Design a protein around this ligand. Structure first.
Ligand SMILES: Nc1ncnc2c1ncn2[C@@H]1O[C@H](CSCC[C@H](N)C(=O)O)[C@@H](O)[C@H]1O
Length: 380
């Protein structure tokens, strides 16, 4: 392999334990998609890494030690990550959760999720996609009892990977409650598992006897959790037509009567106007948009999140709760808070809680940017 000399800033990252190689720190770089050995300014060995374009990064540190990347290396990787997750395997209440999370498990560019009897792999750059044989071979040694597996490409977008086929749609269990999911359709699966603990809080009664508005609902997974926790009623608003059948499916799977659960297909900015005109108000408002969305407005979470808080407050009950969630990697905790304060203006409010990624979505403790989920619960 090539020995690569790194500048002082690149060095400073490595020695504090950051695995991510950012392009800013490697402006010199005319090499790609390969494993390298990194050296300092004065010819000292810094570690083995690989190079591949991934958003703002050029690669990842693999080990501070001199190592060979091959299948036996991945077997070790997956033995360690499996061993952190023993409790997931012993409790029967949750059958869908994350097995492997990039640098959270010491190998950036790969995630792996379990969904009942099937697994899902996601490739975040062209190098890991090039070596999938050895990644998949190692995983199937360490986890031989899955019936089949699927893949997402994150860098044709989705494909069956090995073993049996899954049904187009099927039920998994999370917190003792059923959700309808699907593995071979676009980039999403019917649920973001990383919100497992926010859903659990709702099932446990955090919205009992209360009315809930759920904005950018997707498949209404937050609404079904609230309903199972005794919520008096829920309203789930999403721009996309597909939200109807995909939401109905969780409610039928839990034998829930939908008399007081309404599904709405509508732009969230139109919903705010419609709700004000009809004097609708809700005890709890859950806000969880995508990080960037396209086309009667363009939505960017960095710039426009203040708008959602501002307009939600107009339709919140006295002593109401806002649950403000984002999965954007590019917005820090402090930037997210700043958007929220901008939305509140002068209005008194209290931050009751901050929730971030659960332990299966493991994080590199040295890199704060890895913890990309932020969920604030705010009391008005
Ligand atoms: N202006 C808008 N109004 C309503 N929904 C929108 C929108 N822009 C994007 N969306 C929707 O936002 C969703 C992003 S996925 C959001 C995940 C969801 N909070 C959950 O709990 O599972 C997509 O379903 C898309 O249809």
């Amino acid at each position: 392999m090539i020995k690569l000399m790194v500048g002082s800033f690149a060095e400073k990252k490595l020695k504090r334990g950051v695995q991510l190689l950012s392009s800013r720190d490697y402006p010199n770089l005319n090499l790609d998609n390969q494993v390298v050995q990194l050296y300092s300014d004065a010819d000292i060995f810094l570690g083995t890494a690989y190079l591949s374009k991934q958003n703002k990064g050029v690669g990842w540190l693999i080990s501070p030690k001199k190592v060979s990347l091959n299948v036996t290396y991945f077997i070790k990787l997956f033995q360690w990550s499996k061993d952190k997750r023993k409790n997931f395997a012993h409790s029967k209440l949750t059958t869908a959760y994350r097995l492997f999370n990039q640098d959270g498990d010491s190998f950036g560019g790969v995630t792996i999720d379990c969904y009942g009897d099937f697994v899902l792999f996601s490739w975040y750059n062209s190098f890991v996609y090039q070596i999938r044989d050895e990644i998949v071979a190692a995983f199937r040694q360490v986890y031989p009892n899955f019936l089949g597996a699927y893949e997402k490409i994150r860098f044709n977008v989705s494909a069956h990977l090995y073993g049996q086929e899954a049904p187009e749609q099927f039920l998994i269990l999370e917190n003792g409650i059923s959700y309808n999911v699907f593995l071979n359709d676009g980039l999403m699966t019917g649920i973001f598992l990383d919100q497992r603990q926010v859903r659990n809080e709702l099932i446990n009664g955090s919205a009992a006897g209360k009315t809930v508005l759920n904005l950018f609902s997707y498949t209404a997974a937050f609404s079904v959790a609230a309903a199972m926790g005794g919520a008096m009623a829920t309203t789930s608003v999403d721009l996309a037509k597909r939200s109807r059948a995909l939401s109905l499916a969780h409610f039928e799977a839990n034998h829930l009567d939908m008399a007081n659960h309404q599904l709405v297909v509508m732009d969230v900015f139109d919903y705010f106007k419609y709700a004000r005109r009809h004097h609708l108000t809700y005890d709890i408002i859950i806000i969880d948009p995508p990080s960037f969305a396209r086309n009667k407005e363009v939505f960017s979470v960095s710039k426009d999140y203040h708008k959602l808080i501002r307009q939600g407050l107009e339709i919140l009950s006295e002593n109401g709760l806002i649950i403000a969630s984002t999965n954007a990697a590019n917005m820090t905790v402090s930037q997210f808070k700043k958007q929220i304060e901008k939305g509140f203006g002068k209005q008194k409010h209290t931050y009751l809680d901050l929730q971030q990624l659960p332990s299966d979505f493991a994080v590199n403790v040295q890199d704060e940017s890895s913890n990309y989920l932020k969920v604030f619960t705010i009391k008005v």
